Amino acid sequence: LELRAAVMHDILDMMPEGIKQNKARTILQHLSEAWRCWKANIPWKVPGLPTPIENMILRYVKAKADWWTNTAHYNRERIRRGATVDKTVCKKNLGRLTRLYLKAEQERQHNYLKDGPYITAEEAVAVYTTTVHWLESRRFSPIPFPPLSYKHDTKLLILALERLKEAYSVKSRLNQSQREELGLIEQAYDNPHEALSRIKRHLLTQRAFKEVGIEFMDLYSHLVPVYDVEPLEKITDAYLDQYLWYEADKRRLFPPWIKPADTEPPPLLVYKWCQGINNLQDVWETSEGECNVMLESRFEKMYEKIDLTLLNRLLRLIVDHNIADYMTAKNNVVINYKDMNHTNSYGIIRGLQFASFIVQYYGLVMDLLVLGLHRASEMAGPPQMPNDFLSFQDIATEAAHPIRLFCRYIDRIHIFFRFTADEARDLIQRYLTEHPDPNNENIVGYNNKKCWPRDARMRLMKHDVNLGRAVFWDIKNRLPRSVTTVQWENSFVSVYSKDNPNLLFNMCGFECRILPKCRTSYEEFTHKDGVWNLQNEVTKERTAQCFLRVDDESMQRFHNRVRQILMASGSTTFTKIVNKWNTALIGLMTYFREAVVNTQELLDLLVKCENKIQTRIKIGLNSKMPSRFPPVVFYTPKELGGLGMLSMGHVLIPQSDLRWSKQTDVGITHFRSGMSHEEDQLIPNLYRYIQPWESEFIDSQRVWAEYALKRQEAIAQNRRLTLEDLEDSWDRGIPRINTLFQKDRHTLAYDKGWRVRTDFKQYQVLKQNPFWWTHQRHDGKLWNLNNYRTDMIQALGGVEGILEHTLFKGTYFPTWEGLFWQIPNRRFTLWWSPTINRANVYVGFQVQLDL
């Protein structure tokens, strides 16, 4: 209002040429339409105007743009935690940053066409020759053209349509775009040949695409865009991604150097990497001047600096010419905002359905440049006998290798570079000659973990800190700055020497600490039974210990996820607030089974959040700040009429809440449960009723070995494996064994890349789905909490004790059996009426309703 009133004060003073029919609200409307045109980052100015009137309008618009950009950056700096309170500022800060993200992409795409920020065309011919030499050395056949009469196209179309239907349409969905999306899915399901003929004509002929809508997700820590595509082009793109992954599984075009694949995405990224680091040829021994350096870093540039010309040339080398033109043209269609309309052909769209094959294309291209052509041939091995995810051809291959292991994430990259005595002195001499530091400035800035940084962090020595700069400088100079750079602010290179016995590495889910017992390790606190005993594959003894603490980025993401459920109180039901936290806790406790027990800061976040939600749900009932709310009104399951909150914390039930009373014929038989020896806890934590990943992987090795022995006994004796033979072999193992015995077992096996497609599925969906761990189709249900509800009812006081605190005695039911059915808030508040309205729950009160 002050900028609007001063604009009218300036326009009536800064030369109106006297009283000559001066301006009015239309001049202020001209300034209003100029700001609205700039708000969508459009080049529409206000033409056809006098020069001082336009200069006075552009001066106030440039000053208002300084105020709005400063107000956007101030709210974004307080968006991580800031205030832990946001009613309508969350939608405004996300909408203001969506305008800045669209305008910066529009100026960058316009600079790519006008100026020339290319992919360094002299070196780009070497990158096309490197992929041509690596494919010829592996002798991999290219991806064939899609057949017009493919028998495998029926299973490929059914698997892609099942993923599109289960993602969008779940429950309570209705929109103008969701109507045609569910309609085209049902029309394709009733006519598979009609959709297959339409998908064939869309690929071989239509070399363009329609507009796509970009919308940023509601992540307070770091926003991630979601690219909503056309409904007709989405079903066509899903068949291209399913056929490419099915062909890559048969042709083996994706090496195991980059493994986000659907084998075991939590354990094998951590436990098989830790067992691979321990089973190396004299890895923990470093008394002979040897040194190890684990460099963990993300590329953070292979999503927007992608060259469409190099991606099209690599697609012609990988697939047919018809599939290559359709895949490149889908990533250069349109970027339509809410009001803006940006151009394209400046990078790769990772929100499309065919982004999984494009990510694996740069994954093999960047790993070949970082490691080497002759390096990768010694790492993966010959195609006649390929290696495992962390294996080698012989012991002499890993002996003369400077890079012992190379595990590549979709965005991150891990390398356990092993150096000898002379190799470390030669590398630090090249790093000091190219980058000197006479005033000890090489140890000025250096990232370190938070896993007790007093005797377990990286020991900042002289030779150890010099090798930390040298190992990163050779990896940074190996990759060009146009394709994929490697910053230091996101990297973490923890060295290993005689001075630093503790080793640290941030894995895909959490941070890990490897410390062998023979090398005089750290204090070894071991706060719970979550220390992995990593054994050597040769000696089969206690080689090294592995600590598994939770990460700081996941703890901040859970603190933001618990803040969203706490801020959603009042505008929803009480049962919806408890069910939102139970799904958020089961996704965190199962994925961090060993980590949540061995992290004191993670348990402090759970005891604070669970006490906050029980404070939040109690205010929605009454607003008098009760003294001692009963825990039976929250921890009761939904079958017995309760909210059903998973108690991941010591919330003990008091002794005055476990007494039953009934008077049938003689008198009131006051029953009481006898557990007052030490304590009567209401419900145990979920970590006690969830198997840890060290015990799960150890039992799974005995599960499939007994399965292979019983199947060999059934094949030799010519007997049928019955359910009694698979009773004890049904638990779980590596993957849920019931997933192999499903009704759709023949169709689910022909869809490779289950973990990789589910990772980009959350990148393309609107809501942040907590399904990044695994899926129930391929992996199967692992967190079986059926034994928790039986223990929660037995510890609360039985079915008679839970019903005694309810209004079951007034309902006049002669037997406690199945009798279930602002409106759900009214039924919940009336059911626990003697529990939520008493003298102990509310102290000072004598209010009577009526007569």
Binding site: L603, D604, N611, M625, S627, G649, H650, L652, E679
Partner: peptide
């Protein structure tokens, strides 16, 4: 006070959002 208050994880003095005093009475 019927609980033992030693099995409890770190401390629970008052869980009613009013802990002005920060003391345990050992110093």
């Amino acid at each position: 006070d019927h609980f033992n208050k030693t099995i409890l994880p770190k401390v629970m003095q008052v869980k009613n959002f009013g802990r002005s005093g920060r003391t345990k009475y050992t110093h």
